[PDB]
Write a protein that binds this ligand. Structure first.
Ligand code: WWO
Ligand code: ZN
Length: 257
């Protein structure tokens, strides 16, 4: 039932998923002036050299690039984390217009899109068990602005027309997610949730301060996808973002400045 519309969008979610009005929901606005610098936060360690992508999938809400997470191949550690967290999939959130699309905001500024690289804590042995734990996921969030093309993104954009509608999927091997990272790993970090149902409160969010630039033609290709399945009426996959939620009793920490 849930989705992104007038009748089943974010403002409706709490009827099926009451944790939508919980104590540590995401995303949030990052108020850069009131983020606390923590000189004890460590550099983020992103070890993606052995990554193995498998498939790309239109799930009706976004597209996911899935990875083999059956060994320690692509891992996030360090930063604010105590564990080792395995990459399972990345996906994006984007807008109908370049002026919106991100889930997190920075001093109320929306970006055109937001990449989420989803990782699960290896102490829990698999993703489905990890989402049931308060320290089960680490999601690395990267803002996209429209400008110059991101060449490392183009392999993703070029396959989208094969997964146009809900439930479609395609082989997607040898994709290197290092091509999607900005130069700096400076980040903000806070405890939150999945930003789609089931909205579980299992995520340590790590949001990079520096956005990547993508071209207008790259983001236009994301907006040609469909939320509907093949042979159902066309509804463009745009505006699949959840807006900022109340910060409540949380402090956002900065690794920098
Ligand atoms: N946008 S998010 O990064 O905060 C997010 C969600 F909001 C979310 F609900 C999910 S969920 O659908 O998997 C939770 C269901 O137990 C994932 N996880 C991505 C994923 C999806 C399918 C298979 C593997 C990973 C997820 F990454
Ligand atoms: Zn997401």
């Amino acid at each position: 039932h849930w989705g992104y519309g007038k009748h089943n969008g974010p403002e409706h979610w709490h009827k099926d998923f009451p944790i939508a009005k919980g104590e540590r929901q995401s995303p949030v606005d990052i108020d850069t002036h009131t983020a606390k610098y923590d000189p004890s936060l460590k550099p983020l360690s992103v070890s993606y050299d052995q990554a193995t992508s498998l498939r790309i999938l239109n799930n009706g809400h976004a597209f996911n690039v899935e990875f083999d997470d059956s060994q320690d191949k692509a891992v996030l550690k360090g930063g604010p984390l105590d564990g080792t967290y395995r990459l399972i999939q990345f996906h994006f959130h984007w807008g109908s217009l370049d002026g919106q699309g991100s889930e997190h905001t920075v001093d109320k500024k929306k970006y055109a899109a937001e990449l989420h690289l989803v990782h699960w804590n290896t102490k829990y042995g698999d993703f489905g068990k990890a989402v049931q734990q308060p320290d089960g996921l680490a999601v690395l969030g990267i803002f996209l602005k429209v400008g110059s093309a991101k060449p490392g993104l183009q392999k993703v954009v070029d396959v989208l027309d094969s997964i146009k509608t809900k439930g479609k999927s395609a082989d997607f091997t040898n994709f290197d997610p290092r091509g999607l990272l900005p130069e700096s790993l400076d980040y903000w970090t806070y405890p939150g949730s999945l930003t789609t149902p089931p909205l579980l409160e299992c995520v340590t969010w790590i949001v990079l301060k520096e956005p990547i630039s993508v071209s207008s033609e790259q983001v236009l290709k994301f907006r040609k996808l469909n939320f509907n399945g093949e042979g159902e009426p066309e509804e463009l996959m745009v505006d699949n973002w959840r807006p900022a939620q109340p910060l409540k009793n949380r402090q956002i920490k900065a690794s920098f400045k």
